């Protein structure tokens, strides 16, 4: 057993690090992936603020997935106070939600491809570079994200930190022209995401057929069960979500308990293995002390007393019984979600009545009852819980998808060459600002 540490991680959102115990062959025996993002404390600063403000602050948790926190937070206030929003507000929120899933998955394509090979070769994708095919692939991705962000701004008021959601519905319905325009963009987008989906699935299939990859000069063997774990999965919807206002909620708050990293992470250790050649700047100097129990910046939520995986594979396993697991399975599941996003948008536009009401006639002020809302954010189940009384937030809690994935990914690190530990991590599409909030 030796101790190697990668810090910081790269090609993910936010600031984390990997603290790995390895055997004499350099395979992980027990690795801890933990956040080291400073804790802004959204849930604690929320207390005493108005129910209108708290969702706009929580949105600023993360700029890749602001839709998820705006919606989960707003609908937790609606659930605590017993507010039923109009049908045309729900339709605009679903359009906003699906558009944002398209842009997030596409962004993640940018972050993972540098680890993938142009199929049948030993050249890795470089997207920066003004060469083919990398450059025409970047162009497709850029137009997908652009369509996605435009639809989001139209139905949501803003692509990053949507302004249109409010307690009781939306500020604005959209004009007949706006609806035509979102339809036109989603028609163009459906063709593109099918192309991109097929492209990415082929690249992943080629990776599943490799025996090694190249990391800073060396060949690194590619294990067959790369990134396997036994934690299972948790998901609340294939697309949108669920709240405590529902006749049959698809999440059970009685099965949840958040603990401290204390119960699941490693205690103090000292780094006795180092590699200055790891691209690009090497690992932690030998002799450095590390304590994942105390350096980890997140809490550990559990379901039936155990950490779980959330995200696109969690969703397909829960709702279609998708039966592959691990790193490449996670990549596959995520790409398969591309078309649903655009079919949803088009179905929703078709039912939207641009003359319809978007604000509930009555907004109650709340009596201190607990409500919750789950949003199936691009990376997994995003659950906000709230007690609102007299229009003020008296209690608030956020169980964010990457928070769920931290201890579960850590366990998935067993059996991997420490040089591709980051590849196991990237399959989760991590957002460390989200996880920490």
């Amino acid at each position: 057993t030796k101790v190697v540490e990668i810090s910081p991680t790269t090609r993910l959102e936010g600031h984390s690090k990997l603290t790995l115990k390895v055997n004499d062959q350099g395979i992980v025996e027990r690795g801890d992936w933990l956040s080291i993002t400073p804790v802004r404390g959204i849930e604690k600063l929320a207390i005493g603020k108005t129910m209108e403000q708290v969702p706009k602050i929580a949105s600023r948790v993360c700029g890749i997935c602001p839709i998820a926190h705006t919606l989960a937070s707003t609908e937790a206030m609606e659930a605590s106070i017993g507010c039923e929003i109009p049908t045309d507000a729900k339709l605009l929120r679903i359009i906003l939600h699906a558009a944002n899933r398209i842009h997030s998955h596409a962004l993640h394509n940018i972050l993972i491809l540098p680890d993938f090979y142009i199929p049948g070769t030993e050249k890795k994708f470089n997207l920066f570079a003004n060469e083919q095919p990398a450059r025409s692939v970047m162009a497709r991705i850029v137009r997908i994200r652009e369509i996605a962000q435009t639809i989001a701004a139209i139905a949501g008021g803003e692509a990053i930190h949507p302004s249109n959601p409010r307690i009781g519905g939306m500020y604005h319905n959209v004009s007949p022209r706006a609806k035509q325009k979102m339809a036109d963009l989603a028609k163009e987008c459906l063709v593109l995401v099918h192309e991109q989906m097929e492209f990415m699935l082929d690249v992943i299939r080629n990776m599943q057929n490799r025996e090694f990859v190249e990391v800073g000069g060396k060949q690194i063997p590619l294990p067959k069960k790369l990134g396997y774990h036994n934690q299972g999965v948790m998901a609340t919807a294939p697309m949108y979500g669920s709240s405590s206002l529902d006749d049959n909620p698809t999440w059970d708050f009685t099965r949840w308990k958040e603990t401290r990293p204390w119960d699941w992470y490693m205690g103090e250790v000292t780094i006795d293995l180092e590699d200055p050649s790891y691209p690009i700047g090497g690992t932690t100097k030998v002799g450095t002390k590390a304590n994942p129990q105390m350096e980890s910046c997140t809490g550990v939520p559990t379901y039936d007393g155990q950490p779980v995986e959330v995200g696109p594979r969690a969703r397909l396993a829960t709702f279609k019984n998708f039966d592959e697991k691990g790193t490449f399975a996670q990549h596959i599941a995520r790409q398969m979600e591309y078309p649903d996003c655009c079919y949803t948008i088009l179905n929703c536009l078709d039912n939207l009545n641009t003359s319809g009401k978007v604000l509930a006639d009555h907004i109650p002020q709340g009596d201190g009852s607990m409500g919750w809302a789950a949003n199936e954010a691009p990376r997994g189940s995003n659950i906000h819980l709230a007690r609102v009384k007299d229009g003020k937030v008296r209690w608030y809690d956020m169980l964010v998808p990457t928070t769920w994935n931290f201890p579960t990914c850590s366990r998935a690190l067993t059996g991997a060459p420490w040089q591709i530990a980051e590849m196991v991590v990237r399959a989760y599409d991590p957002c460390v600002s989200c996880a920490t909030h």
Partner: protein, 253 residues
């Protein structure tokens, strides 16, 4: 000429500032192709440590009780010719003004300051989210300021001046800016621009004059920024057609 060297430093931010930049689409790829190298950005590239930079786009604010974070921002000033506070968290604190600690697993992570409170800042790009157009414009103008003829470095230096004046004015942003420095000053003309730019619908105009929902406002500084009676540099803004043509040229294929 050489491309300038640009880095993306991420403090206590949400990565939405980075996303905004990327939402320049092919304009960003044109910039990266012809005018700038991204020497650092943990989100997009594997460079683990802060190299030297001609321009550093710093997003987020600084948590005073995270040692590594105070070090990163000092290191960034040391390693960079131009420091840009990118976005309202970096310029003015924004939602991290509201942080006060007590959350797992670092209840002591309590205090957050905009970067200009710890280091000297040359340029502000205010907004939450910041507009892609502004980030692009500021990046092109930084390149002219460094690799252009004297006619461009003069243009570029006049364009950037109000964004540099904002960095010297202070580190505080709020709806009350419009009271203190506009209405209270005899300067408000009731155009309504502040209402359009506010990202949380905190501003209405009542009888032609601003009305702020101060418990909705997230303290981003956008409204004083966009107000045409905060800064109005007639030498740049009256040449709008020309400066627009130049900018479009610099990105044409």
């Amino acid at each position: 000429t050489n491309k300038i060297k640009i880095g993306h430093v991420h403090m206590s931010g949400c990565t939405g500032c980075l996303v905004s930049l990327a939402d320049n689409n092919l304009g960003l790829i044109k910039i990266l192709d012809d005018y700038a190298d991204l020497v650092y950005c943990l989100t997009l590239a594997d460079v683990r440590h802060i190299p030297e930079m001609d321009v550093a786009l710093v997003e987020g604010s600084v948590c005073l009780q995270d040692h590594e974070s105070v070090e990163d921002i000092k290191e960034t000033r040391k390693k960079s010719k131009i420091v840009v506070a990118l976005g309202s968290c970096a310029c003015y604190g924004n939602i991290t003004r509201f942080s006060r600690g007590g959350q797992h697993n670092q209840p002591q992570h309590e205090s957050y300051l905009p970067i200009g409170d710890l280091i000297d800042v040359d340029v502000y790009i205010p907004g939450c989210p910041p507009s892609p157009e502004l980030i692009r414009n500021v990046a092109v103008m930084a390149y002219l300021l460094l690799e252009g003829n004297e006619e461009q470095k003069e243009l570029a230096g006049k364009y950037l001046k109000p964004l540099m004046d904002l960095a010297k004015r202070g580190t505080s942003g709020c709806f009350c800016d419009l009271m203190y420095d506009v209405i209270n000053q005899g300067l408000c003309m009731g155009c309504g621009t502040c209402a359009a730019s506010c990202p949380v619908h905190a501003i209405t105009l009542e009888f032609g004059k601003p009305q702020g929902e101060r418990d909705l406002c997230i303290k981003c500084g956008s409204c004083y920024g966009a107000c045409p009676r905060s800064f109005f540099n007639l030498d740049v803004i009256s040449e709008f057609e020309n400066i627009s043509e130049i900018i479009a040229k610099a990105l044409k294929d």
